[PDB]
Design a protein around this ligand. Structure first.
Ligand SMILES: Nc1ncnc2c1ncn2[C@@H]1O[C@H](CO)[C@@H](O)[C@H]1O
Ligand SMILES: Nc1ncnc2c1ncn2[C@@H]1O[C@H](CO)[C@@H](O)[C@H]1O
Ligand SMILES: Nc1ncnc2c1ncn2[C@@H]1O[C@H](CO)[C@@H](O)[C@H]1O
Ligand SMILES: Nc1ncnc2c1ncn2[C@@H]1O[C@H](CO)[C@@H](O)[C@H]1O
Ligand SMILES: Nc1ncnc2c1ncn2[C@@H]1O[C@H](CO)[C@@H](O)[C@H]1O
Ligand SMILES: Nc1ncnc2c1ncn2[C@@H]1O[C@H](CO)[C@@H](O)[C@H]1O
Lengths: 162, 163, 163, 163, 162, 163
């Protein structure tokens, strides 16, 4: 076993969702999950066909997001992984829909942080995803006042709680 | 320190395998029920590695070949709370969302009929877990627009899962 | 270039732990609500590893013991976006599905009261990922038709989860 | 040649009722399982109108008071494929998502402790269907910013379902 | 407000599923829910487009079942109602997928019993479903002997329980 | 006997209406969060008829036009535990599955921008429930292969929801 670290580019205003699925129908099912989630949303989806032609398959509505999706696919280089990049939507806007796509088996990351995918290579052409490093270690525990500012952020800034 | 081990997963033609991790003894009867209620003709085996107490591989089936594949696989992986399902006469897409929703199922590793290996970490004597999976082969290149059009044709005219 | 470290998870009698990965600071509030609306008189603590900005283990609880258990285990794992929940007077099967459905939550690694280690990779300093769990111990043998009866009756007559 | 009839629904203090439509005789063990696996020490009784064959009200319970209250609603409503559940030590919120996901359940009409009526149509003798429910009473006015602040306080400080 | 009783034709070997949805996309989404549930299923699905062209939209893989579908729509004749007829699958095989189709708002019946739909016409051309009459009323309460024999059945015959 | 009323539902260009039944007072807050966290732009107004105690129509909103539409329809329906949502900059399919999953939500009556009528049954003074809706118009005929081609191209070329 060889462990390789695959660094994920996230231009600002993007988020990436990286996970695993199966069956070629994953790329059309994911295009439809995203496109029926948020009017407006801009995305690229790529999926690593793990057999047959073994082609990186893709759908997008934005060209920059299609190339990003497709190059992470080629960098990860691991059968059945999929990569989504989104603009004009947050992951929480589309997560549950992705989760319920019957091809989707698991999701490794949903984020905009600094992000590494840990890949095992066990033999040439035989790769899998072993984990992610989504952002950074803690610096401390939150205090009573860090709490207030997080509660006030949710209610006053992004308005997701009352 | 930590030992990594690679398990080759037997996939007789016409089978698919679903590997996951769950908890609690009720896993095995709840998976059994997920499966049987999903596709009228479904043939399956299911095995679950009980991680405490007696620590037996619990199983159910309506096929003996598939029951046996499932138990061997759990004997090879030998990781607490891991389960193994082998299926004939259903595709994983037919069954997978009902597995996800089984209250004991925390996680699913793989669902495939490709060449497949499991990465198991064994950290101590008799203390193993799944690190991950190698599902088929890495990519040979990028789909062209003409590639897209045969896969679209495949989905609409061959398997008819699309209009 | 990768260090694997093993984090042993304390589970005092009567508590189960749930470990997974999420994203976004609303994670702590949504998790709290999923816990408290699931079972009356559940007690629990939940801690979340905010992966950037101030970088704080964020927490909620209605039990002081179970709170510090969770804050502590996040302090030790030290991996961005990991959440840990400890619960009494609730089984993980009474709360898990709600947990799966929290939009922030992306994966669950373990729900258990077994002996448990989390294997963590560190790639640079400060930069850590949960790679897997070792939930309990490996199988000691296959179940026989008598051990099957034991397990069926225990579900029927003792915990009363099946008819 | 349609008559409607109103069925009043007894709800003793500390119970809630759930009434729905389903199908197939497994409805009753599936709803059994859905309830007990949701909350430790929930008390309940569940009844279901089998609409073909021997046409028997089918039932399961861990409380005889709740089980008779459920059978009696079934016998009144007297509509094929309807189910009634009465529960103590659990709120409809602790259990509704699992009920909705039971593959036999097609709709839920009410989950409530309020005063309740079921509107039933009878199209022929022995042929009946639920048309509606009357759950509690019609509004008296519109919430003021002050009523709002007291409802914010009730969910945060009293019940603790929000933060 | 006139109430009108529609009798639903159920051929030996079919089941019927009748609900309410919205938006034209309903018909493709229902077709995909069905065909990705059970490999062998034959079905017909029809949807009552409630605006615009206002037409019965259908998809099928069985002409008989396709027509049974269109025929019950034409009778209920109520905006946004959909009808599905299935051979070689049971409702439990598909129901949850159908629940989670974003266009689907309610399901009124899933069954193979003698069945009536109650339709309210409030205005000409303005109709909606008010209920169903799914088979017949209870003839008695289960005994424990009856309970044993239903449990034996689920366990030994349909094999859905252990 | 029973009094059936017809409530004509106003739907401005650009809005849609979602009408349903829930229970418990936390329904207004949970509906609010299900909307704000489904789509970044979404403008809406939510109202809910509490059906016991104070019996107030409870409301949350970020659009004063749409708050007023939802409160006014609740006042017109005047049926305990019914809820109304008006939304702009989001289609029902964007938010619906989320609504279906709010533990309080028992059922959904309608999701539409079509001419819409709610049929209410008043059964004694102040006891009202929803018996049905009339969502747009009955069929003008049956789709041909010409119109199916046009429909398939509408989904794939105009809205881009299909491929
Ligand atoms: N026709 C099909 N319908 C559904 N799933 C399929 C089909 N063909 C293959 N699969 C699944 O997709 C994987 C990759 O092709 C296979 O290993 C199998 O698991
Ligand atoms: N306002 C927001 N709404 C939804 N998700 C967000 C928001 N801000 C940040 N996130 C997500 O959470 C992570 C920050 O914790 C980001 O990388 C991003 O994925
Ligand atoms: N009575 C019970 N109900 C639900 N879950 C349980 C019960 N007993 C044990 N478990 C779970 O199953 C695991 C043992 O297989 C335990 O670690 C615990 O998490
Ligand atoms: N073995 C079975 N599996 C699934 N559904 C069934 C079965 N038998 C009957 N049904 C359904 O249950 C209804 C009768 O309760 C039938 O009309 C049919 O819809
Ligand atoms: N482009 C679209 N995307 C999503 N939903 C739509 C669209 N157009 C119409 N609808 C919904 O479908 C109903 C029209 O049948 C409308 O009333 C509206 O609720
Ligand atoms: N604290 C509570 N938690 C959950 N559900 C509640 C609570 N109080 C009341 N309810 C439910 O809501 C109704 C009050 O509208 C009651 O009939 C009951 O169903």
């Amino acid at each position: 076993i060889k462990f390789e670290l695959i660094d994920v580019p996230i231009p600002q205003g993007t988020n990436v969702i990286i996970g695993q699925a199966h069956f070629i129908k994953t790329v059309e099912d994911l295009y439809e999950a995203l496109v029926t989630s948020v009017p407006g949303v801009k995305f690229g989806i790529a999926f690593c066909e793990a057999s047959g032609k073994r082609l990186v398959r893709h759908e997008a509505n934005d060209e920059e997001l299609r190339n990003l999706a497709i190059d992470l696919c080629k960098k990860i280089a691991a059968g059945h992984v999929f990569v989504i990049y989104i603009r004009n939507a947050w992951p929480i806007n589309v997560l549950n829909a992705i989760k319920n796509v019957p091809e989707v088996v698991r999701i490794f990351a949903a984020t905009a942080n600094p992000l590494k995918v840990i890949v095992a290579e066990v033999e040439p052409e035989r790769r899998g995803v072993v984990g992610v490093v989504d952002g950074h270690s803690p610096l401390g525990v939150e205090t009573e006042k860090d709490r207030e500012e997080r509660k006030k952020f949710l209610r006053e800034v992004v308005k997701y709680k009352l």
